[PDB]
């Protein structure tokens, strides 16, 4: 600690994300306190791919009531790293 490898959570599997695969960019959930500068060092270590323009987004949780008991969803924070051209994906593999 701190280490790049623990910063990531899970890949975001969405139809909107699958379209971004041809854009040479891949969404990943990231810790709320993490900065863009940290994410750039993660891909360079874990994937080894050169990093270009990283985008990061936060989401307020939606309500998910179960009978009487309402409760807010945890705040996810996915990141979008636009990988440089000519770089093999490790996603899905």
């Amino acid at each position: 600690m701190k280490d790049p490898r623990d910063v990531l959570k899970r890949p975001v599997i969405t139809e909107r994300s699958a379209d971004l695969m041809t854009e040479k960019k891949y969404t990943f959930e990231v810790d709320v306190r993490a900065n863009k500068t940290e994410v750039k060092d993660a891909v360079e270590s874990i994937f080894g791919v050169k990093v270009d323009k990283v985008n990061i987004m936060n989401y307020k949780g939606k309500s998910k009531r179960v009978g009487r008991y309402t409760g807010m969803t945890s705040r996810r924070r996915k990141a979008i790293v636009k990988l440089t051209a000519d770089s093999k994906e490790i996603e899905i593999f």
Partner: peptide, 24 residues
């Protein structure tokens, strides 16, 4: 589906003009 439902009631008020006149 839970189909939970809730009902709320309130007393409120008020006016009192009262529009009453006489005797004077």
């Amino acid at each position: 589906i839970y189909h939970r439902i809730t009902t709320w009631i309130r007393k409120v008020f008020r006016m009192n003009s009262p529009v009453n006149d006489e005797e004077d």
